[PDB]
């Protein structure tokens, strides 16, 4: 019932000079032209979708080429449509989530295998990988977080969890989620409540409220939609430096106006250049792209 | 069970210098600035949102800006909510959907209310106003339509439709669902076949496929997508003229780069201005702003 | 003493799969790939220098790659160095001055022998081309213009004059300068009073002042910064739609935020889709995009 | 004649949150916010101009405005106009070049003397300050950087060189030009040989060439755009990382492509973090950014 199996999961490579939406397995991987190198020069990063959805969304496309239009990024968008159930909502979503999620930790030990032929045979290190979830997806990236530890290959750079899933992971241990042990630098992205948690998971943990989104509807009507703005968000920080500017988690937080580069950080890719660390609250606009703040810090 | 009542209804009016999202009712409308003239100037545009929705989403919203932006548009956004069973998803959709359809008429008498009373004591010309409508809004603006005619107004300029609802409409009467004949030209926006339909409806069908929006994941699982993407479509055409061209439905459509405005029409507030009726291709793009084409025409 | 003479002038032709930066001549034309086919589909835009430059400088160079990024544009740049005495700058400016200026209409014809060529040859419709030219090259372009009348091949579709040479020229009459009725649509942008001139030449006229550009410096040590800054100008506005809005030219010109397409007109290459006519106002930034507007109309 | 004196020269100081384009003197500058303050916890950077210009230029501005919108940067950009004969620009450019080439010296101990300040009662140290000149505000530059030594404060962490003036320097003894000796760390940036000079004056030598910059025109027609090339792609630096990488200097010069931080070096704030020393060659492109690789190392 929506199973698993490396056979099953694929990805799509796109680099600046690559957007050929083919799809590839373990196998036909070295058929890419970036992969015909003996070295891969480029920043990597690893894209995987959570629960019922899939590599080719809008969404998770749109993200892929806010990174390979930057220059040096080879995108590995990681589907598992089949293991994520996406192939057959059926009836009884709370036993498929569960299937899904049980399966996290398997994609993930795919993106470690994934890695260690990155590493190894490309010889990409690790200083250079990145790795982007949603949902359950982020779980699946922290599982691979761990994997490679385990692997002997040291952690990856950063672990970005969009929207952590929050039923079957909020009060799991750190060894069954995403956890700020399982990079160097894992990043958070909370936005929905039910579908995600508030529960701090990382480095640093974005409060872009962080429950019902502006512009996306009633409190849990639009639940669906507040869960989706974390992938949303995301790409806008990746396009634009510093489009949301968080400030130290507080009652009464600061503006953003009163920022500075010592106690707010510039929610995406370069979050971690920022010393500030913990939970921050970050205020949103109602429609794209919801930027917080003109200036940068 | 998800009512319908005059008093219930609400409308949020915008105009370039009047973003007050708040709410008004055919009591506190003329409480509005712009409508504490003796003569309205601008163009006027309903936006109507279909079935388990509501006005002020970010679509909508963003529908709204588009057209107010450009000057001398004054926006009224239809809310009916309550009569579209937003606020009760409590189980069995197919009863709802019922209601909400069956309620579609009187939201239309409705608009029609507020358009005698545009015309008569605003004097705002027919020929000024247009009307949009999603799913069963789209059936909701045809009964307008068909209201003022009967009022003795005789016909608004346009209607759009976007993606209306097909399930209870696609095989009515004219008289029963939006039709053709509704207005002195009727723009339809085909871009799912299960929720919307692909019957021929208007004046003008652009099919932009229509159905399985790209972008939206799988076939079926990606149907509310492809469903709200007639939403997003038009607002891009709003903002940046021949987004989209379309080209005579063809068993081999010809590519858009060989449009001239003789057998093509850009989709928009400006396609009856191309002469070119009937039903139309469309290929679109996997993520905003979609656009199929550089070129104007 | 700084010669004018056909062979000395070249060309570069840039399209988006082929930016060689290879010049050619009316000889080494044909030998170009984009004119090995027996048609050329492409929107045509000459670009033209003016007094001592060159057709490989950065700025127009940069307005060459806005056109050709735009997907259907074949651009020429007309490189007229020696007639427009680049190749000699040994003192007495205002003698050169007055040399590079009599070899305008020659330059002129050159350009209209290779619009002939177009035509005739590729089945080039005059509706698809357009001619840029700066200082010297605006006056120049003119010349193209007329030369084309003359040659029975109609109009071309618009002639963009960024600032116009004034002296020797903003008193001769319609036939000895670029003139409102050079082409269908004709474009000025005014942004130099010394090196340019205020007087009236198009069938539209933006003054972006226009004089002492934002940022150039002392009003007469900057001159010659102001006088290029309509090349800059141009190029943003073909980056970017809007970039630069014209209001009706005022003692007190209203504001852009308050403007409409039917009284202001977007600066660019769809300008003359905006139906006021005659001179028009435009404020500026003192920085790249100088953009005044993030609306468009 | 073309006279120096400190009341003359002025400072324009620049804070994310000040962009006041006001002017201050070694007297009203405590009436700046910024310096109302016990300590200054900025990294603070001086932009000196050269022969004929001015600390509002263009291109100066612009800087200023990458550096500051970095976060933690006071931007004091020096303006001695007066002294480096811009008010007067009448005729003989060799003497007055002669004059503005003495005051050199006049207008380094000036920003020595404005540094003594904020290192003995703003607290600022040495490590954290930056000199940045263009021309001959390269050499005021390294002039300061000798007083503060002999004001015994220690040296300045970095002095930045762009395009140093050649003429009355090219040969001069290391006390009477800017030097390798004068910070911690000394980048040249070399793009003019006419204007600038060829010979080796840092820490590090970048040779964009280093003369005729690509897309400024013909070889001593575009010397002066060449000669100002250095302002804007150091300026580009600051902006994007690695947008310029430099290196070895040979008679066959490796690509950028094969670069790593181990013999290349991305020319910037950032360079003296690069290993390698000594002369680099830099490939450039034509066109704003000018960027020679997409990578970072
Ligand atoms: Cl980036
Ligand atoms: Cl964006
Ligand atoms: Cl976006
Ligand atoms: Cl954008
Ligand atoms: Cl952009
Ligand atoms: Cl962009
Ligand atoms: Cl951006
Ligand atoms: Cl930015
Ligand atoms: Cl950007
Ligand atoms: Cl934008
Ligand atoms: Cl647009
Ligand atoms: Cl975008
Ligand atoms: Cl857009
Ligand atoms: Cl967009
Ligand atoms: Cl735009
Ligand atoms: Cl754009
Ligand atoms: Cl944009
Ligand atoms: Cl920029
Ligand atoms: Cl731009
Ligand atoms: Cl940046
Ligand atoms: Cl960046
Ligand atoms: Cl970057
Ligand atoms: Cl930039
Ligand atoms: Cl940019
Ligand atoms: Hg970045
Ligand atoms: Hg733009
Ligand atoms: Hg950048």
């Known amino acids: 019932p929506c199973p698993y199996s490396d056979d099953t999961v694929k990805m799509i490579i796109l680099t600046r000079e690559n957007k050929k939406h083919d799809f590839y397995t373990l196998d036909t991987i070295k058929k890419h032209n970036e992969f015909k190198k003996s070295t891969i020069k480029h920043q990597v990063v690893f894209i995987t979708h959570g629960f019922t959805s899939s590599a ?101 750079s950063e672990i970005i969890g969009l929207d952590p899933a929050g039923p079957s992971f909020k009060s799991n241990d750190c060894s069954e989620r995403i956890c700020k042990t399982d990079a160097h630098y894992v990043q958070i992205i909370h936005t929905s409540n039910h579908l995600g948690t508030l529960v701090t998971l990382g480095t640093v943990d974005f409060m872009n409220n962080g429950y019902n989104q502006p512009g996306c509807g009633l409190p849990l009507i639009g639940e669906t939609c507040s869960h989706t703005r974390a992938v949303k968000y995301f790409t806008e920080c990746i396009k634009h430096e510093c489009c949301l500017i968080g400030v130290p988690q507080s009652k009464k937080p600061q503006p953003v106006s ?22 921050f609250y970050v205020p949103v606009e109602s429609k794209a792209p919801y930027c917080n703040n003109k200036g940068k810090i």
């Not at 779980?139 to 290959?153: D, N, P």
């Not at 580069?261 to 929610?267: A, G, L």
Request: aromatic share 8%; net charge positive.
């Open 56 to 156: 080719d969304t809008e969404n998770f496309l749109a993200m892929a080429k806010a990174l390979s239009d930057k220059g040096n990024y080879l995108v590995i968008l990681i589907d598992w449509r089949v293991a994520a159930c996406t192939e057959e909502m059926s009836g009884i979503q709370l036993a498929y989530y569960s299937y899904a999620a049980s399966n996290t930790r398997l994609v993930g030990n795919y993106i470690a295998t994934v890695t260690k032929m990155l590493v190894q045979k490309y010889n990409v290190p690790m200083a250079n990988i990145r790795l982007i979830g949603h949902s359950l997806g982020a779980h699946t990236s922290g599982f691979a977080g761990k994997k490679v530890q385990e692997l002997g290959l040291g952690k990856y």
């Open 258 to 279: 009163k920022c500075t580069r010592n106690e707010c950080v510039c929610v995406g890719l370069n979050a971690k250049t920022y010393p500030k660390t913990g939970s």
